[PDB]
Ligand binder design. Structure first.
Ligand SMILES: N[C@@H](Cc1c[nH]c2ccccc12)C(=O)O
Ligand SMILES: N[C@@H](Cc1c[nH]c2ccccc12)C(=O)O
Ligand code: SF4
Ligand code: SF4
Lengths: 322, 322
């Protein structure tokens, strides 16, 4: 029974990849009954997108609207916006005084990802503030983000040592969910036009699935394919294909006894099954205008009072006046 | 008629050097009737002294007590503590997103002054926040600190350009006051035991002045000296030696017709003249316990409301939700 913390940067409309990776895990942690703190990391959006803020406020709200459509329940999780919890800035600043420049340079997520800014360098320090300010015990993350969890633990340890013992050492909760490719085999990116937004229509989903990439081995209908080399098959898994349906595809495809059209019809049925409730939810949320604003203010108010309680300790430990 | 901003790090009891350099200029700017914002930079104390915070809160208060004893009047200046104005942390963080790592590395005050920390690198960004958050027009500084004013102007310009025009470009107000050496010729440092605290007693001042270094040329009483090579002479200037008294010293010393004892008796009279009111003031302040706490809360409350007004603009310009 745990204190979970996680966040997402508002960079746009949420797609299939945010859902089957991150958000489903978030909802699973929520339903298992842990104390979940989930937020829109709007200040992290600035570390990389300080050149285009024209849609930041708007994307921030949309991200919260999306969390909600996907099952993030504010009656049981704390949902908030990073920029509203001013205490994160203060802790980030305070932690920056105990972390070396070289240590931030070693971060792989750094040198791998304009971005020559002080802000991008201390990104992980801010991320440590986000996690440690709610004294989180678990942080759901994909293998890619593990290095930021290790630093946070170091920060916690160096802090507890130099001052007083205030912070638990948080641990990563790794996703088993495999990364989903784009609708055309390659990685998901907006520039490749291979993305599927959660808020797509049935006609547009129907058309995106039908022109989707299949195993290039199947030049003709009579040519058998190999689902391991097929994006459609990868999508079948993300959308809860039954043991029966998967034997049908596998034996169908490999024996060249089903056509990809039929195979995609099955993905459509299953992916529409997962999306229909999310689509309904987007409609229910919009009919109560202010529902999302109310959720944001209430949620951020709650995150704030937890954060403030932690800062009282932090300031007392560092012997600061205020 | 201007908006003046400046601060000092609480590193200890204030001495002669804080008074005749920085504080006298502060009081002069105050008396000329400018809008002065003066504060204890307790977070900057952490950039260098994160290893010894045991006396931080205590030194912070003492620094404010000292500002007051020296004539910083809260009925006309805004006196506050940096850590109490949380908005500084937020602006610092926001400015860090628009300043390069290399630009912070170029800062001479950096590579010239443990200190391998992220916090020490972004020190000037925090200092830009301190200055630009009150939209200051003038910042009193010694030649040494000029480079931090130039960066702040760059930050302001890059911000106004990328977002909306929120900040004036502040300018440095350079001290004419020459640096005062220690009581033994060399630079002032606590490790050389050549410092004179403002809160010294008459007996201790009397004794510190009498054993003070004189021109080594005066081996004997009959040997003339050269006041330009004498620390006592340098102190005479900081303590408002009259044209008459200075002709007496100069002709006395160079003609070997006065003795250093007599010369120091004159420094004593004059330095005691400047210190007696400050000493009385320390007594008047202490008889009203809470006077300093009241001043700190009232002052910081006032700095906060100005700072918050500036942040509303900053957040609106960067299109952040909160
Ligand atoms: N940009 C970060 C956002 C973030 C900040 N703090 C976090 C804590 C946990 C997870 C994510 C975060 C990310 O995508 O990971
Ligand atoms: N350490 C800085 C303190 C400071 C922060 N902001 C400032 C603005 C003006 C003057 C001083 C400051 C200094 O001594 O200069
Ligand atoms: S039958 Fe299905 S798994 Fe096989 S290549 Fe076609 S779309 Fe892909
Ligand atoms: S007479 Fe005065 S100025 Fe000359 S060496 Fe002595 S103390 Fe110094």
């Amino acid at each position: 029974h745990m204190r979970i913390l996680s966040g997402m940067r508002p960079t746009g409309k949420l797609h299939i990849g945010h859902l089957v990776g991150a958000l489903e895990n978030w909802v699973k942690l929520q339903e298992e009954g842990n104390e979940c703190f989930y937020f829109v990391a709007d200040w992290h959006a600035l570390t990389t997108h300080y050149d285009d803020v024209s849609k930041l406020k708007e994307y921030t709200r949309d991200l919260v609207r999306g969390f909600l459509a996907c099952g993030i329940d504010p009656e049981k999780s704390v949902i908030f916006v990073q920029s509203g919890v001013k205490e994160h800035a203060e802790l980030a600043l305070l932690f920056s005084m105990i972390v070396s420049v070289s240590r931030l340079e070693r971060v792989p997520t750094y040198k791998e990802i304009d971005l020559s800014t002080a802000g991008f360098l201390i990104y992980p320090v801010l991320q440590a503030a986000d996690i440690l300010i709610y004294k989180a015990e678990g942080v759901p993350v994909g293998e890619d983000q593990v290095y930021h969890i290790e630093l946070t633990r170091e920060i916690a340890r160096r802090f507890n040592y130099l001052y007083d013992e205030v912070f638990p050492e948080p641990e990563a909760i790794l996703s088993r969910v495999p990364k989903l490719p784009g609708t055309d085999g390659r990685k998901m990116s907006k520039s490749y036009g291979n993305i599927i937004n959660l808020e797509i229509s049935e006609k547009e989903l129907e058309q995106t699935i039908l022109r989707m990439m299949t195993d290039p081995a199947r030049v003709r209908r009579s040519d058998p394919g190999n689902p391991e080399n097929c994006p459609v098959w990868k999508y079948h898994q993300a959308f809860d294909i039954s043991e029966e349906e998967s034997k049908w595809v596998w034996e169908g495809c490999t024996t060249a006894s089903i056509g990809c059209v039929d195979c995609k019809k099955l993905l459509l049925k299953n992916m529409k099954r997962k999306l229909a409730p999310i689509w309904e939810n987007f409609r229910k949320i919009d009919e109560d205008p202010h529902y999302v604003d109310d959720v944001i203010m209430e949620g951020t108010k709650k995150a704030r009072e937890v954060a403030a309680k932690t800062m009282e300790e932090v300031r007392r430990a560092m012997n600061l006046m205020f």
